[PDB]
Symmetry: D2
Subunit: 226 residues, 4 copies
């Protein structure tokens, strides 16, 4: 299977409450935190990591609201391949709901032992268009809808994904400090008062694709909840 490191936001029953979690190759989060999923409101996720601290951290917030944060000491050099692809995933249950990404930005940096040796990548979407050639859209994912990214069909069990086209060089054996930082504003709107949903920022192998039966709780990242 694919190598997945993710930061999911799910409201599925399958802890008995909405949470934010850090998944290292398994849907069974290595660490979680209570999340107050606010239907209709726009939320913001901040994911960060640096090779010095070897600590992955995320923070989800809503305006005038709470903020769920979850960290996990992990050396991605041991988990992920050298070259990866980053993305966003989403899955819907039996509920009518949307997983709209309003914005998305990423920054990766490899700093070598030598002088002025920085290597970086940085994309920043604040408006998706109909023909977004720099995004690999998988599943029921689409663009252009209000200049937004619709991960799940805009709905009865839907799984969508959107990874950036260019492969990302997460780590290097010669780097003194490698680090990344992602951010995205979402909006989960559902008519139902308590929908089962799930978004996630994931890092995977350059050729990761939706596993068969990765629906619902599997977030489109895992083929089974092993």
């Amino acid at each position: 299977a694919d190598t997945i490191v993710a930061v999911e936001l799910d409201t599925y029953p399958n802890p008995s409450y909405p949470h934010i979690g850090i998944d290292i190759k398994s849907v069974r989060s290595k660490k979680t935190a209570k999340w107050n999923m606010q239907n209709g409101k726009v939320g913001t996720a901040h994911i960060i990591y640096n090779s010095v601290d070897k600590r992955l951290s995320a923070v989800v917030s809503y305006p005038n609201a709470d903020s769920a944060t979850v960290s996990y000491d992990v050396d991605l050099d041991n988990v992920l391949p050298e070259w990866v692809r980053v993305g966003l995933s989403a899955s819907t249950g039996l509920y009518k709901e949307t997983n709209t990404i309003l914005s998305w930005s990423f920054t990766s940096k490899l700093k070598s032992n030598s002088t002025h040796e920085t290597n970086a990548l940085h994309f920043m979407f604040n408006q998706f268009s109909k023909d977004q050639k720099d995004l690999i859209l998988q599943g029921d994912a689409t663009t252009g809808t209000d200049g937004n990214l619709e991960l799940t069909r805009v709905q009865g069990s839907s799984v969508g994904r959107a990874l950036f086209y260019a492969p990302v060089h997460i780590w290097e054996s010669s780097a003194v400090v490698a680090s990344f930082e992602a951010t995205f504003t979402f909006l989960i709107k559902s008519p139902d008062s308590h929908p089962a949903d799930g978004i996630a920022f994931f890092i995977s192998n350059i050729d990761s694709s939706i596993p068969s039966g990765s629906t619902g709780r599997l977030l489109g990242l895992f083929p089974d909840a092993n």
Copy 2:
């Protein structure tokens, strides 16, 4: 053929080394005298913005001269909406190298609405053996000293960034890009025929047949 907009640095015998702006033709739309310094590391600065509709480049060497060349052009009319950026190089009958020590790019689409910036930005300061985010064409290679060797070390090589770039948009108030790269042309011969170039092309541009020498690996014919 492919749609090419380039900023070349050639020493192929106007009757002298120059820096030029090519719009779909190897016959530069505008040039400037360039003092090609063999062995020394040079720096190219290419810039453009939709407001000014003026493409400009500046090549310099440390403690040296600086050739600059600008050209009023609306790339919205020349280039497709989605492109791929890159570096090209070709050698003549001479023993020489076209080593890219560094390369960075920045593209920005600013919409009419509030806080609506879209951007892309890569920065190579050290190329590795397996550079998956670069499409290497021709005799181009990586890892050699953590550098990019465009030509074989009559050679022709290319290196384009993997992700397609969104140069323009009909809804943007201001689109702009900025590239920079440090080169080093070393040749045993005192007066070699060489040529590097920063080019913007269609996402699927490939080395045209017979685009050797003066054609810079960008054009199939000068006519």
Copy 3:
């Protein structure tokens, strides 16, 4: 007097219409363009310059609207001192109105002839606070009001200014390419249908202060319309 290079947006009668203009040491713009001042709506100004082109350019736009642009070939090396301070200015006439700056960002870069020799400065305000120590507030200018910058009193003839604390190194004799880029979102709200107002992004000597009698058409930048 002070050395002023500015990009003003005025609706004063004193051409016979609202315009956007480039001022080089004189209130009498060196170049202007028709501006459709939209009362109540938030506008965005984009000012840019680079030593290669020696061309100053500005672009003002409103959402779903028009866009006034004005350029002017000028070598700031000959006009401005090496070290300057950047800022925003505003003045009100006999009208009740506001000059609210919602955001402001600047980027200055000095690139030398040598390798990897970039020098830069970059600030970005998206929310002003009550105690904004990194801003020199002159005139009736204030902060904190909604986390915004109120240039003119929030009004019967008011002149305010706000310059960044750190001096900016615009040019250098040893640089191959110097360049700057500023952006700011404004909002001019007036009860009157046709108010006389004026905002401006200005570059001046590190110790520039509101000239005596620089009210109204003088934009708080010039002591007299010479």
Copy 4:
């Protein structure tokens, strides 16, 4: 006294050269063994973010070792809201230099609302004679090779950035900073007593009386 948070690199005889994190005291809260390489250019990387509340530094030399030292600390409780950042240095009885070749900083305040980022970012790659955006204290100077000479070329010098920095805010979901600088300590003596440090202090911090030698120009007494 002033409020000082610093990341020092001293060779003043623990009984060996080290890299340390000082929170209001010269007696480091955490240290690590540092192989001070005389003559060679080193690079310090200091980072911090409000989520992790962990200050970390990493010092390296080309083709060399790398000393790293981290310390869990909430700067919201230590530092004032508005500060000034800088570099400090002190020499012992030895003939030596404390040359800063480059220096860059980035501070970011991200609010709970949408697209609410506030940032500051300076980047010196070449200091000039009249560097108006730097507050030079002590024997500190600029222009020498387009470099920053902290100590006299028992010296003590400092260089803080002019604009006050807004480290934290009560309304921010995530605040963070990142500094980097390349130094070069050259000494004729094989084992000199020296010390550089990146420090964060109150906007009006000045060299304390008798903050020489081991005190790094930051503290008036070690007690």
